[PDB]
Design a binder for these strands. Structure first.
Length: 389
RNA sequence: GACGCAUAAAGAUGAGACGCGUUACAGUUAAGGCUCUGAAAAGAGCCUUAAUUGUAAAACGCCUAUACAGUGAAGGGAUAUACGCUUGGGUUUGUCCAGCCUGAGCCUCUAUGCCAGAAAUGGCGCCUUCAUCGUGGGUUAGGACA
DNA sequence: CGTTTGTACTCCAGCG
DNA sequence: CTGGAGTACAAACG
DNA sequence: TCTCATCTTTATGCGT
């Protein structure tokens, strides 16, 4: 669930960024900085990289103080007033989704009929310790009051030197009194002492004039796969770079090897990225959502076998209903009427054979395994010759 | 031994951000190629590759306008609010979940931030209503039986 | 003899 | 890892 | 990468 959490975080971060840009745009247009002005362009471009602020910046990505200093420069040269600068800076520092962590995960008492955080019941946790000391109850209460009061620590040290308590007990007392007690207690206050689901791939591909391609950095192009590089000059340069540093097969050059091979360096000090042809894909796996073209591995949901007016079987792949509007290529246009439908992992048999197979990968001629007696080998049979068991 | 407490390490789950990468469109720069013009140097157009700048997209969908957000005013602010309790709802489907979001009523449990102040306290964040201005918001890349 | 299914083989997938 | 993709060669239906 | 919160398991003590 870690990767789904990361995708969810990327999605929500982008949504928050759309929220921040809209509010800034509305406010700047409300002042008089319409989108043609230089102040709108500068302040709006700075909002795409508003910086971090989780750590403090020393005295006089980027930190948010650097970004806000640039925003201050942009608005002062744009003749803005201090209230408008303050409101724009308020938009830069605004929190759009509420960060809620104080009371989220709750623990229930183990007794047969919510438990507090440990940091809120330090008195009870100290009372759990000092209740077993041999001294009287008035001294127990005085010790409990002295431990929790941060000024009376010397009295506690005097008590422990007097009564010769164990070092681990003194340790426990000071960690209950002082430390940041993360978590909740086992008991309440009355009882302390008593495969996959992704429709498409994450990186969009470029699909122009029938050619599927994408950009990869020079340090991401494996040695045996150099021929996918579209640029002739950089393909031969990368071939000579692989020949120079004795990369046999598999993984690529490192950062230092790529820089020493003479490749250009980008402004963020990464290596240049090359346009490469994408293998292992086809035009039938291409979907377009907004501007982006993606590969989908869930493009087929089943196989439909049709009987025409001549009584002859023909197989057509049933495409995914969730993606049918987004396929670039036209859908199947079957003649006649449907006879039967073959889903993935259905058990089938082959015309003229007695063995029982099951569909591993599907299509017009789906790929079938033997259920019993398969050595891991498979074979493809036309779906017109199959029938469901 | 069991249980509780404290410490430490590792892992998991949820939340919120900062960046890199990818893609689409537009601009700029460099290198190369093709074509036209010219007495020639070279001028111009198109294409490719790389770098660079800006803007936009990153589930499909479903639900929500009886919603969501901004601004201003007024009132409340521990005798309070909700991340809590009780009971519903959206995602949600063929059925059931998780996770997240959320309505109404409520304060038994749980939680309650930032700043100035030794402190009482105050001011913001927060809650409600009204006015005004807009069109926005939640959840979806995870499971189980079908 | 000319299409048309059918093996053999190789390649594909976001991350600090 | 699944659930495909393309390509080369080939053996089989019409 | 960073921040915030909780949970589980494994030790090592202490207490009943």
């Amino acid at each position: 669930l870690k990767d789904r959490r990361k995708q969810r975080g990327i999605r929500r971060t982008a949504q928050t960024k759309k929220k921040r840009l809209r509010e800034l745009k509305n406010y700047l247009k409300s002042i008089g900085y319409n989108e043609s002005t230089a102040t709108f362009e500068t302040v709006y471009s700075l909002a795409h990289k508003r910086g971090y602020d989780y750590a403090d910046m020393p005295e006089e990505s980027r930190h948010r103080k650097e970004v806000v200093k640039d925003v201050h420069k942009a608005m002062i040269e744009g003749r803005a007033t201090e209230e408008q600068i303050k409101r724009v800076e308020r938009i830069f520092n605004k929190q759009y989704r509420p960060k809620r962590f104080n009371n989220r995960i709750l623990t229930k008492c183990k007794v047969e009929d919510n438990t507090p955080l440990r940091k809120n019941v330090r008195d009870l946790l100290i009372e759990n310790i000092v209740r077993f000391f041999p001294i009287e109850q008035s001294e127990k209460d005085n010790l409990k009051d002295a431990v929790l009061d941060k000024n009376r620590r010397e009295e506690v040290k005097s008590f422990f030197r007097k009564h010769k308590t164990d070092e681990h007990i003194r340790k426990q007392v000071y960690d209950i009194a002082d430390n940041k007690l993360s978590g909740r207690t086992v008991f309440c206050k009355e009882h302390i002492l008593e495969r996959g689901s992704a429709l498409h791939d994450r990186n969009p591909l470029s699909y122009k004039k029938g050619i599927i391609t994408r950009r990869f950095m020079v340090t991401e192009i494996e040695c045996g796969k150099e021929d996918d590089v579209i640029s002739e000059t950089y393909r031969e340069k990368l071939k000579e770079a692989f020949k120079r540093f004795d990369t046999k097969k598999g993984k690529c050059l490192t950062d230092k090897e790529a820089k020493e091979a003479g490749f250009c360096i980008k402004k963020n000090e990464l290596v240049m990225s090359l346009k490469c042809s994408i293998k292992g894909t086809g035009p039938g796996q291409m979907i377009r959502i907004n501007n982006n073209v993606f590969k989908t591995n869930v493009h087929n949901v089943g196989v439909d076998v049709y009987l025409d007016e001549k009584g002859k079987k023909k197989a057509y792949e049933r495409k995914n209903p969730r993606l049918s509007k987004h396929f670039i290529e036209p859908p199947p246009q079957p003649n006649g009427r449907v006879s039967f439908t073959l889903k993935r992992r259905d058990m089938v048999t082959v015309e003229g054979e007695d063995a029982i197979y099951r569909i591993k990968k599907l299509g017009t001629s789906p790929t079938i395994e033997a259920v019993v007696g398969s050595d891991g080998k498979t074979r493809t049979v036309s779906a017109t010759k199959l029938t469901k068991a």
